[PDB]
Amino acid sequence: LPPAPRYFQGENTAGFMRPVRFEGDITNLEVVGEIPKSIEGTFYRVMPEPHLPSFIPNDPWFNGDGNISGFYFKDGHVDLKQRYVRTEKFVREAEARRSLLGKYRNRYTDLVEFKIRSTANTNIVYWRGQLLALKEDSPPYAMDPETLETFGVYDFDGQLPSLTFTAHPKFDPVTREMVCFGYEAKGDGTRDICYYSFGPDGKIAETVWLVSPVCGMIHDFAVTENFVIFPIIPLVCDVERMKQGGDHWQWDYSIPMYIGVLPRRGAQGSDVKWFEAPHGFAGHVANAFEDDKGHIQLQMAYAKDNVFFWWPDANGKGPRPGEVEAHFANFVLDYQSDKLPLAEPTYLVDDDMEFPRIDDRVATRKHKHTFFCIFDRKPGVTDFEFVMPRAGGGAPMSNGLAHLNHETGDIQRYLPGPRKLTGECIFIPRNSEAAEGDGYVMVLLANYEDMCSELAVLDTKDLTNEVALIKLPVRLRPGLHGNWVDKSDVDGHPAPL
């Protein structure tokens, strides 16, 4: 077999990116300042964190075993619980005490035959009394919200119609539906998209099979009152390339950024329209909604080149690390239009941004508040001389958060400091009567001075000020998505506005 290394090597596991691989508890976390005593609930987040050194050199960040953090808040106190998802990969590798799964989404490089290749490392959501640990090549893994025990692969009581479940389902605050899809829904290289939804009682509602023009990466999607929308990243899969040991994904400069629009209820596969946005990278969706004219306003991060630069085109063409900016774009779509090409989007702010969150009490409807990560290259904002030698590689960088008020155009910016970077934030309603976007924001910080993690708590009334700073004595490696589950929400999701 390829040799199993006994310590981590390479930039993707150096410095702050070095795996810690701890599971367990740290109660009564140290707090500077004061956590508002009315906050009650749990911040769950997932990070890729390789449990064993890979036999693949420079294995991408996205291929790391999912490790779940829960920060449990009550009466101004907070406890951390941490546990790896017990995926097939995790368990078999733990038994063997070495890596067995090979290249990202390339089963032909695996040392044993896996049934499920999930690292369950991308998102962690709450649904009907369970956590679901998500990875877009796989079904969810169900977990206990209190103990973080893994129950196993979750197939929604045998109803799951797809081999794949997106990392970005949307929760309709009015209907209480979980709206879902999977791409490559019939396996590697398939152009099949399965769109499906579940009512609050757990029963499957929609199931529509449609066909993508290319086998392209559909990382995120959007949902409005009457439509679902599928933006395709111009990374394309060829299984023949994979069989020869090549990458699952390869950029294609010759295609548009497709944006599929399908009626949300009662559609057939052939009802999809594949609009063609200017070539670019489909970043995360803030939210979409239908305006007065019935046109879809799709607000999302959007770049003009390949953000995943480690997967270049067939001739190795692509950007360098740190080159590509994504901007907060607004695309207008009209399902009734027979014109497929779309105009360049308008931009809501100038910042290089990503990881947008809204008040999910208005998800799928008109929103007027967005919170997002920013990367400001202005001299001094980040002390690169100090940070970069300690940072390692393979993950995106954020040196602040921003809050945009869409009505007034006002922006507040939170800068944690010159030697700190941020993850994706969460928004917490102040209480059940709070106006849209009014409450608290939390975000995990990487502190490169201490080489420790911190959890910052902000009040939306003044995003520049930390109300509390929770000081972890360990590192939580840079992660992907996370969610707030408020104690006052019986089904884990906030009530509609």
Next chain:
Amino acid sequence: LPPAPRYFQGENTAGFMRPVRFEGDITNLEVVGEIPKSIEGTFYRVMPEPHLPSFIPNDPWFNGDGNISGFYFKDGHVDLKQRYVRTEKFVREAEARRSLLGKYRNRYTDLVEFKIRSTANTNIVYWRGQLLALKEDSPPYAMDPETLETFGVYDFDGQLPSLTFTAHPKFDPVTREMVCFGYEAKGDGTRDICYYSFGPDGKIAETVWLVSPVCGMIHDFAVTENFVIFPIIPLVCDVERMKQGGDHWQWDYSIPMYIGVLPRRGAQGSDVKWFEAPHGFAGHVANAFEDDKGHIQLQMAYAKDNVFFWWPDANGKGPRPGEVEAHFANFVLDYQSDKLPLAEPTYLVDDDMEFPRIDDRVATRKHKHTFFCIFDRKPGVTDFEFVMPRAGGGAPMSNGLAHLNHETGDIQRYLPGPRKLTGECIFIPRNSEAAEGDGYVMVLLANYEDMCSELAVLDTKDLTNEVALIKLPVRLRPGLHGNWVDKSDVDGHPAPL
């Protein structure tokens, strides 16, 4: 109540002394080099690690909640399990989410009435299928060796005759007895010493009540074939001082270092003889044995002033941090002698030393190998400019290990490096046929460059060379005692030579 701080403050919890307070698992630790594949068993160690910030300012290191580490070795692989002892203190403070126990060994400063005040933080030994977490003011807490679950206060099936159980019981490799004592055995300030022992079947054997000339700290003791020996540190307890909120311990410059000798079997309390060594600090016992003439050779660390300088004399007089050195002393005692004053000891090496270990297969008999911590002030051995600002305070420093061959007088020194310090080592027999002192030594390192801990594995054939260096991505705070439990030993203790 006195205010409960929400983060740690003061030198005793700064830098590398900052509590981490993690409990859980880190499997498949990173290894540089190669752990010998034939090593099979577990290294257990205990550290004081406050679970909650103290309401006592500059609370001594010795008053921190006991946290148990287990390093489980097999086939060249190693896993860490870590868990706090569930003492009465730990549980009640966890329930309250604040500190309740007050000053070290002073119940009159507690905010609630405790039955047991143990932090179980000083030693962790194996006995008849359980771990015993030891603290000299208390009975042991029994724990599961595999899971580190706490069973509870242990009273040896109702046989324990004493309120107190030493942190330093001895295991007779021939008789398989556990030889024990407790001082202040009838409560705070009492001069009662209870000497007691247990046969390998768990039945109590000896129980002798004797009387100390002063109520002094007896941290360690020695056992030979026919005698038990009690060296008294000139720290003295006055309960009236404690009732007014004062320290349990106060140095007394006017008294000798008493060394009590009692017949090991069948004695009465009045058979003890209180020999009087020159004034000084009774450090840890390497081992004691009877020579050809039946004279006791007692080998122990010995200082000429108060190592515990934070507990000075009645007028506040004593040494500064880092001033007092301890030396490896040999005291000769003759039980038949009626002359109480003893001569100054001879010294086996010149190093400032402590924490001596022998091959416990010859415990209570003649030994010819000792392994010990050293602190070498020779320029360059420790980079103090770098280390001291990161070190915090309250714990002793060791910048190497030494191996003395007592026959040849040869010494080997292991220096982990200029920016690393060590804990107490353990010795592992190479195999069941190994000669005395032949095998492996392990020791936990504090790495001040990385602010991480490491576990070094050494071969006794060349102590200067690390065969393996196990790299932890967290800190294990400086700790107290630890023990090896070999998988090949049915009762957890090695067979006699």
